[PDB]
Every structure is written in structure tokens, then in C-alpha cells.
Write an enzyme that holds these catalytic residues in place. Structure first.
Site, PDB file in Angstrom:
ATOM      1  CG  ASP B  26      39.755  41.264  39.778  1.00 55.08           C
ATOM      2  OD1 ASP B  26      38.524  40.864  40.669  1.00 55.08           O
ATOM      3  OD2 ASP B  26      39.257  41.608  38.637  1.00 55.08           O
ATOM      4  CG  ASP B  28      37.098  36.116  38.161  1.00 52.64           C
ATOM      5  OD1 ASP B  28      36.718  36.555  38.955  1.00 52.64           O
ATOM      6  OD2 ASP B  28      37.164  34.736  37.533  1.00 52.64           O
ATOM      7  CB  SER B  59      35.830  39.876  43.232  1.00 55.58           C
ATOM      8  OG  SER B  59      35.223  39.276  42.176  1.00 55.58           O
ATOM      9  CG  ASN B  60      33.739  45.138  39.767  1.00 51.64           C
ATOM     10  OD1 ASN B  60      33.815  45.371  40.854  1.00 51.64           O
ATOM     11  ND2 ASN B  60      33.946  45.912  38.681  1.00 51.64           N
ATOM     12  CG  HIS B 180      32.952  39.313  32.583  1.00 51.94           C
ATOM     13  ND1 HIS B 180      33.690  40.070  33.310  1.00 51.94           N
ATOM     14  CD2 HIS B 180      31.526  39.733  32.862  1.00 51.94           C
ATOM     15  CE1 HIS B 180      32.918  40.848  34.018  1.00 51.94           C
ATOM     16  NE2 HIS B 180      31.753  40.729  33.811  1.00 51.94           N
TER      17      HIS B 180
END
Ligand code: NA
Ligand code: NA
Lengths: 292, 292
Positions: B26, B28, B59-60, B180
Site C-alpha cells: 500500500d 498511504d 491502494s484503496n 482515514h
């Protein structure tokens, strides 16, 4: 369990209504649908009064403050009701926040409200200070209230999360109704869908004011002597009205004029989910009248 | 289970990295936080390449189309990456909708999108027709896609429900990340919170594109030869990255530079929730480099 989803008719109807001291009704789906009263509903209410049985009304709808809720009843053909007979999630949310809001009496905390002007009016009437009201000569937000908010937005959701970063800040929802069918056949999202977003984003579980919480029955009993063992609860929605009834110890009557279908009741029965099965059902509440 | 949340260091580190053919990261929480690269991260990537090990990124985040996602990498100090190494939920949502959208080839259905311009660009690049795009000389909406939508509204939620009244209309979400943490210490709601509202109001369960679905690993394997048994998955979020890793059959490494805390990993272990426990952890991915 005794709840076997029996059609209430004949001798059984007369004995059930006979014993009952009072009847609690939801409004939408039960007394009326959109602008149209259920035929025979106003008459049933008249007959109840003339049999000396109490009628109270218990709605999850948080859009109207009590006075405009009373208007709503009168507009749809329901006459000499007293406003004191009407209980909504907005009214009962204001009560709860008065009871539970943390902080000193002496400058109070403010409530961040996701909801419209009728909900805001109900809160102010209970003496609650609202976030975004005119400031003195910005109070700490001490609760977030999720109501029916037709102007819900990402930004509002984000602000709510900001307030909820404080573990002492309450999270309250007026109700968890997921959606509602409209008279034009479409559906509108319900407060439960907004509460889902707020709980998900904040990681916090909401205190729910409305049915199927027992809380509204506490509010009713504050004001009225009602013996739940002798009170009928009449509603159209199994997961909200019928569950509420069972939690309060009332005899439950599903009316088929609203959201839930008879086959859903019977499916819960078959699955042994007795808390979601009504004791009785009627096609419409007009069926009750002849029991009086 | 073999996942016992071991700190990866020394001989074990050299043997794990030694065996690995490739590493999925990932971005972030792992390579950077906000505007600040994790010190040593760009160097680790250089060293991986020079050890002949593949690096891909998963990445989501659905906010950027691939080209601007590549920019994001370069801006934060990550050099000669090829755009083909980068996989996002936006890219993978477009793929999925191409694969699954019902209706004829011949006038296609449209996708109602809850999301921003980068997501919309990614969809159009896959050849998808979007609701609200200019009409010919209104197509049937055949899917609702819930992405990261900073302009989410009640009205948009209501329109989504209208489309979803058709059981044949798909409901897809880019990801279910609930929230987040931002570099300024606050939190922003995530797509999962919006998906919660849409699923609640419509009564429908979303197809989820992003982690912890296996779907993104399918997209990766479409393009690259990767043996999951020889691939490390490196992420900061247990419920998203580490669960994804286990579902795909990869060796999982939690980095502590992001959302999940070591004590949460160890708590899942103690509760025997092994699908949410990483095989290994590192304080930051800079710890990996010396194993190469
Ligand atoms: Na109702
Ligand atoms: Na992450």
C-alpha cells in the site's frame, strides 16, 4: 412465545379490545398513507374515546415539532386530538439530550444537529443550545444528534466526526429507520442510513431514541399512567413497531396498510424470531372498530 | 495458523526477503504520510529493484486516475516507477464494471457515480458511459458506483436508491475503508461510511472492489506473473491490507507507520482471529532494506 400472528376478528377481537385500557398507534402506514387517511381510521379513534379507552401516538418521524405534527393529524382528518397525545422521535430526542448532555449547568454544551428546522425547534423548546446558533457578545459541542436530514452532506458528516473525536461527546440518533416508501411509489432514505454513515466514519455506536428502543415508552409513562400489560401497540413495521411492543411488554397488532407484509411476519415466526412476530394482525385498523 | 505477528529482523529477514520474488505495498501509511515520505522508503524500493525483486502498489484510494496517482508517487520522492506498477480501487472498479455491467453491447447502460473527477476519468478511460454525461442528439442506469465522494449528499443518496429499485442494477463500492487519519491529526470519513448509507437505504449489499476483496489481486495477475506464495504484502491496516494478504495466500507484513497499532495485531492473535494477524511486522519499511 404467545405471538403467533393471529388475525384478530370476532370474539377474540371483542375480548382483546375489551381488556385493553389503551392503544398506542404509529401514524404513517397506520392512520394514513401520504395524503390519504385509511378509511375508517378517524371513526375507530372516535369509538375508542367513547369506549373510554386511551389513544396515544408514537412516531419515529423527526421532521416536525409537536405543533406542526398536531396540524399534520388534523389535516388528514383526525379531529380533537390533544397535542399531548403525540410523541415523536424529535420530542423524545430533546428530552433525552436534556437528561444526558454532559458538562456544567452553567455554561451548557451545544448539540450539533443533522436535521431540519422542525427538529431544531423541538430541541430549542427543551432548552438545548445548538451548534451554529448565534454566539454571545463557539460553545463546546457535547452531543451530535443524527435526525432526518434532507441536506445531509459529506462536509456535515466530516464535522460530526470532528466533534466525536471527544469520547465524552454523545452520539444520539432520532431513529434507525433505513428508508421509507413514498405515496408516489419511490423510496426516501431514512435516518438509519445517515446514522450508519456517522457511526461508520466515527467508529461510535449511536444511542437510538426512537422505536424499537424502549425509550419512547419511558417518555410516555412520564406523562401518562399506562399499564403495558393492558395496552395494544398497533404498527405497520415489524422491526420498529412490533419489536418496540414486545420490548415494552405490550400486546402487538400489525396492520397491513404500511411497510411490512404478512408473509414477512410469518417468515419470522417460522424462523423462531418471536420478537419480530406480532400477536395479532389486521388488514387495516378499520377492522378493529367492530370489536368496541 | 503460522501468523504470529513476529518482528522481522536479522536472519529471518534475510531469508524472508531472499525467498520473496516480489513485494506488494500500500502507499498511504506505508511509503508516506501526507506530504512526508517515510525516511528510507525510496531507498528500499531502489534496493528491491537491484536485487531483481518486483514491486507493485495496491491502494484503496479512489481519488486519482492512474496518471495523477503516478504524479503523487513522484511528488513524494519515488522516482522511476512505471504507471503500470500502480493499482487503485478506481482503476479496478472500472475494470470490474466493464466485466459485469449488464445489458446489450449496443446501447450500453450508464453508471451512476458517487465520486470525483479522477474516478470519473478512470471510468471513461475504460469505455464506461456515465450518468449525467452529455446525451445523444438519458440512458438506463445499470450500476451505482460508490467511491470517495467529498460532495456526497442526501439528494445523491436518494437518486442512488431510485436506480437501485431495479434489482438488475449493480451496486459496487470502490472500497469499505470507514475513515482515514489526516496529517493534521483529524479524520476524514471514508468510502465505507458512504457505502454504509447507500446499502442501508437501498437494502442492497455492495460488491466491494478494493482490499480486503481478492479482486485487486485478480487485476494484478491479469497483467503480471506473481506467485502469491512467493510475494510479501506490506500494509498498515489490519482489516484491509493484512486480511487481503491472507485471502490471496501471501506472506503479510504490518508496518507501524500507518493506521493499525501493534497492540491491535496482538489482540486479534490472542482472540484467535488469525486472518487479521500479520505474519511479520516492522516499525517502518526502512527496516526491510538491510535484509536485501
Ligand atoms: Na409507520
Ligand atoms: Na494504507
Amino acid at each position: 412465545s404467545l405471538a403467533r400472528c393471529e388475525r384478530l376478528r370476532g370474539a377474540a377481537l371483542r375480548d382483546v379490545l375489551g381488556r385493553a385500557q389503551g392503544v398506542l398507534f404509529d401514524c404513517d402506514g397506520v392512520l394514513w398513507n401520504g395524503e390519504r387517511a385509511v378509511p375508517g381510521a378517524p371513526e375507530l379513534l372516535e369509538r375508542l374515546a367513547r369506549a373510554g379507552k386511551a389513544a396515544l401516538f408514537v412516531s419515529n418521524n423527526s421532521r416536525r415539532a409537536r405543533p406542526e405534527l398536531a396540524l399534520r393529524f388534523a389535516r388528514l382528518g383526525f379531529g380533537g386530538l390533544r397535542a399531548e397525545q403525540l410523541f415523536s422521535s424529535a420530542l423524545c430526542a430533546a428530552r433525552l439530550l436534556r437528561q444526558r448532555l454532559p458538562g456544567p449547568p452553567d455554561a451548557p454544551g451545544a448539540v450539533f444537529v443533522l436535521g431540519g428546522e422542525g427538529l431544531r425547534a423541538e430541541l430549542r423548546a427543551a432548552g438545548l443550545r445548538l451548534a451554529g446558533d448565534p454566539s454571545a457578545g463557539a460553545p463546546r459541542v457535547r452531543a451530535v444528534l443524527v435526525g432526518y436530514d434532507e441536506h445531509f452532506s459529506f462536509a456535515k458528516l466530516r464535522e460530526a466526526c470532528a466533534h466525536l473525536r471527544d469520547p465524552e461527546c454523545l452520539l444520539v440518533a432520532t431513529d434507525r429507520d433505513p428508508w421509507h416508501p413514498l405515496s408516489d411509489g419511490s423510496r426516501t432514505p431514512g435516518t438509519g442510513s445517515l446514522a450508519a454513515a456517522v457511526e461508520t466514519a466515527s467508529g461510535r455506536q449511536a444511542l437510538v431514541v426512537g422505536k424499537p428502543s424502549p425509550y419512547m415508552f419511558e417518555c410516555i409513562t412520564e406523562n401518562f399512567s399506562i399499564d403495558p400489560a393492558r395496552t395494544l401497540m398497533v404498527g405497520d413495521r415489524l422491526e420498529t413497531d412490533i419489536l418496540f411492543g414486545h420490548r415494552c411488554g405490550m400486546t402487538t397488532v400489525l396492520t397491513l396498510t404500511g411497510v411490512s407484509r404478512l408473509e414477512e411476519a410469518q417468515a419470522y415466526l417460522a424462523a423462531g424470531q418471536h420478537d419480530l412476530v406480532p400477536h395479532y394482525y389486521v388488514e387495516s385498523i378499520a377492522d378493529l372498530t367492530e370489536g368496541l
